[PDB]
Design a protein around this nucleic acid. Structure first.
Lengths: 55, 73
RNA sequence: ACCCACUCGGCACCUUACGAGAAAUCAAAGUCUUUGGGUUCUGGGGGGAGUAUGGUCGCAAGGCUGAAACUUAAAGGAAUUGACGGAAGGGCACCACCAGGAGUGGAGCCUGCGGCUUAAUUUGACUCAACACGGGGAAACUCACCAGGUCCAGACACAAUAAGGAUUGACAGAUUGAGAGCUCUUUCUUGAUUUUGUGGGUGGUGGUGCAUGGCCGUUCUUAGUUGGUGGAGUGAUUUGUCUGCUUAAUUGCGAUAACGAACGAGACCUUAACCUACUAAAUAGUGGUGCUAGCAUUUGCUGGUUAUCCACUUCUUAGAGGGACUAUCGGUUUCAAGCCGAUGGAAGUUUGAGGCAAUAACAGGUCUGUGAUGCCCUUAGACGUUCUGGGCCGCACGCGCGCUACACUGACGGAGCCAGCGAGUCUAACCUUGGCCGAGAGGUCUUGGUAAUCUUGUGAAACUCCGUCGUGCUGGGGAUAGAGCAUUGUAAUUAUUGCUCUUCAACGAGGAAUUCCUAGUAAGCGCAAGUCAUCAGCUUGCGUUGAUUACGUCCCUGCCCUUUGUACACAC
């Protein structure tokens, strides 16, 4: 947003730039294009022997 | 922005506005009689039959009909 | 003579800071504000000046000793960040070269500058980063310039005049370019709406772009820029942000007083390539035919028809996706980042091209885009605004961007058949098919289209097939002029433009110099949109035909990084 304000001596230009939160986007992309998120795997219990699940 | 000659003569000569004369609409003076008429109004019904219309010479000019009135008289 | 371990004394050196220092640096320049081991000499801001004068030494040149008047706010030291270097080392760029291509510079003309001229020839911009640029292709308007004429649109509030009238507007005469009562002997008219002085406004394409905002160009198309916390330095500041290698890239691999981040790059977003995979479609194209055309009926080939049928999206369109991430092999590399080849693949120079684009700046452009503006100026015979004419186009001359050419790889005539981008009419008439008239430019009637349905398969041009021409400024070129027709516009004359006939000039490939360009690119060719009532030789795109030469280098012009020197910092 650029605005002009009128003082006694002239006109001052105001330039406001706001980078908002991509996790608030609610439209379009939800993250920056270079943002790569890794999903953490869930560790599982071992086997140590072959078992058969009983009905 | 300092050059101005105005070779033509001083032209600030705004028009007159009928300089203050005596009371207008001189109808007549009649001792207990109908006030008779001078410079009588023309034959156009648009005039209130009481407006002292202009008459310069063998022609009539109407003030109310400011643009269109011409008669041969 | 060597080799070991000492020792005394030398010329030095490496490391570190107990220390010292303004620092550079110093084992002395340390043991000096915790100030004293002994002693000699020298200095007291910069010049004048190692001058004058006196002395003394010398053959002389000169040496030693040695002022002042006057002048001056800095000279000077050591470092820091930059900028610069006819400094060095790496890495780059067709706004650099290389090898070439097409050219420009030479001609005519078209446009923009400068000068000259003029009433005005309005004005901004002057290397890259001004000069077909202000979307500036100006007949009127635009318009800001000039010759003139009106109009106030001077709001709002204070005094005068003031319905025994503030003051409005007038046909016709004179005046005037003028049916502008603009003004003036002459009369009429609406009435508080105005007129006169005052304060104060308003408008201004008036000034300042060096007082500004915004925007835009440029530095600078390169890869660069900056915190926090640590480390270094008294400090400015520095490290991080780097020896090396790689990449288009502070791109990474890594090295490492740095670790962790942010911007810029990349990623990203559009556009062009591929989909016989999904959704499909009388605004797009596909097949037997209903009907009807021709050679031909053997059992084909070539066409037309929306309401006469069915089925399809190959092609067209768009949505959702998929696809390529250098995929797989070979070679090379502190055997890493990567690079180079080969096979597939639509696509393998981050796939091609763009959009976006750090920090920090420039007193670059713009107050003539803006009711975007501060200050200054004018403000009523105004620099406001409007009307009529001119000028911006004028021409001795110089310059820049260009168009057409100098020719038979051609000119002319006839014949063929081809695109893609895009635009189009509402309180007003756009793109216009077809029939008819005309040689032509153009003129007449309506259905066509507010639009993948109509212009419009934009049947474009270069280009191919036959002919005529024949190396002759020639049928090359079509400048400069005369006559006529038409169109747009209220208006074309110092010709708007087109057309018909006629006129048929330089130019025989261009000096010094200099521009752009690495593949569907250069170049050729035309088309569409922009400004457009009319005017493209200009731009913004589009498609058609489609070469040469490179796969490099730092030689010229520059750029980035590091080191280095600097007496530079308004920064060579």
């Amino acid at each position: 947003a650029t605005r002009h304000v009128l003082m006694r001596q002239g006109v001052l230009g105001i330039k406001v730039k706001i980078m908002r939160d991509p996790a608030k986007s609610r439209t379009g992309p939800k993250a920056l294009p270079d943002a790569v998120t890794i999903i953490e795997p869930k560790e599982e219990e071992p086997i140590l022997a072959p078992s058969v699940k009983d009905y | 922005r300092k050059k101005k000659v105005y070779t033509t003569p001083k032209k600030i000569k705004h028009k007159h506005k009928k300089v203050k004369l005596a009371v207008l609409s001189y109808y007549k003076v009649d001792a207990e009689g109908k006030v008779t008429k001078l410079r009588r109004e023309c034959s156009n019904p648009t005039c209130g039959a009481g407006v002292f219309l202009a008459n310069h010479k063998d022609r009539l000019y109407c003030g109310k009909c400011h643009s269109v009135y011409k008669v041969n008289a």
